Amino acid sequence: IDTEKSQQALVQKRHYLFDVQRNNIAMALEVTYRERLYRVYKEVKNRLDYHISV
Amino acid sequence: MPQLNTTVWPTMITPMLLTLFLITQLKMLNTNYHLPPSPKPMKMKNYNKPW
Secondary structure: OHHHHHHHHHHHHOOHHHHHHHHHHHHHHHHHHHHHHHHHHHHHHHHHHHHHHO | OHHHOOOOOHHHHHHHHHHHHHHHHHHHHOOOOOOOOOOOOOOOOOOOOOO
16 A cells, blocks of 8 residues: 555656756757857957957 | 174174265365465555556
8 A cells, every 4th residue: 555655656746857858948948049149249249349459 | 713703794894984984084074274374465566657
């Protein structure tokens, strides 16, 4: 009986794998978005200050 | 020897035939030794979950 109950508790906690998949996907796409932001920002400022420096 | 008065032999044979092949054997057949109780506290294969 107690083994059955423990199995029930584990299979209750089951959903963490799926929500971790969720978290990883969300974080990955957010990181990519902010990386694009900084890519374009950095490079246009690079062109601008290239002109300034020359 | 009286053991050789062969006119009293049937009355010695037949009740022995009874009491040895019928009555004692029934008295035994009602004596049975049950196998000892082996309460195996370990009988659990349910499964894991599908995962």
